[PDB]
Every structure is written in C-alpha cells, then in structure tokens.
Amino acid sequence: ARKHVQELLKTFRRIDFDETRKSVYLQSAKFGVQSQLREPLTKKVLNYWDDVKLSKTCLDRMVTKVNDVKETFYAGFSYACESHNQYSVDCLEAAKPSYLTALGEIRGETEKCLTTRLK
Ligand SMILES: [Cl-]
C-alpha cells in the first residue's frame, strides 16, 4: 500500500549521493538506483495489503549494499580508472554495466527479504 511506498522511500533517502562529484557520474549513479531499485521495489510494495510489515533489517542491508556498489562505480569512474583519463566518460561507461548488474542483484536479494511477520 501507499504506506509501504513511503517506508521504502524513507530507506532510499538514506542512499546518499555526494553532490560534489562530477554531474556526468551523478546522473548515471542516480539513474542506476532509480531504474534497478526504486521503480521495481516501489511497484512491488504498492501491492501489499494495508498491514503488511516490512523487514527493517532487509531495508538496512539494501542501503549498505547500494552504498558499497555505488562507491565501487565511483572508483571506476575516477581514482581507480587506469584504462582512460580519470573522470572521463570512457571510464564511466566501462564501469557502468557492472554497476547496473550489481544493483539488479541487490534488487533480487531485497525482494526475498522485504516482508516479515506481524508482532
Ligand atoms: Cl526506522
């Protein structure tokens, strides 16, 4: 239901982005989270009946996993890129497919743990 969308988006608010980083990177980083996680998971929880309980531990793990995957993407765009000039579009594009795939794996893991029992 709507309340589950709100609780899920509260968790997405905790997936922060460093706005001092290059805009070309930020656009790709944000798109990845939106397309691989925010849209499909919001659609999923919208279906839940009014009193479904979400697992807080599941949500918390999504946050840390995404933050690690995103830092890895940023490293490949910037200070760990050896294939092209650092901070280049070529570094970004070389690191982007594995970023998106890793976010997709987080989606599947999160879907499995999202709901829990009442108590
Ligand atoms: Cl909370």
Numbering used by the authors: 1 to 119
What does the literature reporting this entry say, word for word?
Crystal structures of albicin and SG7.AF reveal a novel four-helix bundle arrangement that is stabilized by an N-terminal hydrogen bonding network. SG7 family members are quite similar to one another structurally, but amino acid sequence divergence suggests that specific side chain interactions are key determinants for the observed differences in target affinity.
The backbone structure of SG7.AF is very similar to that of albicin (RMSD = 0.51 Å), with the lengths of the helices and positions of the cysteine residues being essentially the same. SG7.AF also contains an N-terminal structure identical to that of albicin where the amino group is stabilized by means of the same hydrogen bonding network. Identically to albicin, SG7.AF showed no ability to inhibit the CP. Like albicin, SG7.AF did not block the activation of factor B by factor D (conversion of C3bB to C3bBb) demonstrating that it targets the C3bBb complex directly, rather than inhibiting the serine protease responsible for its activation.
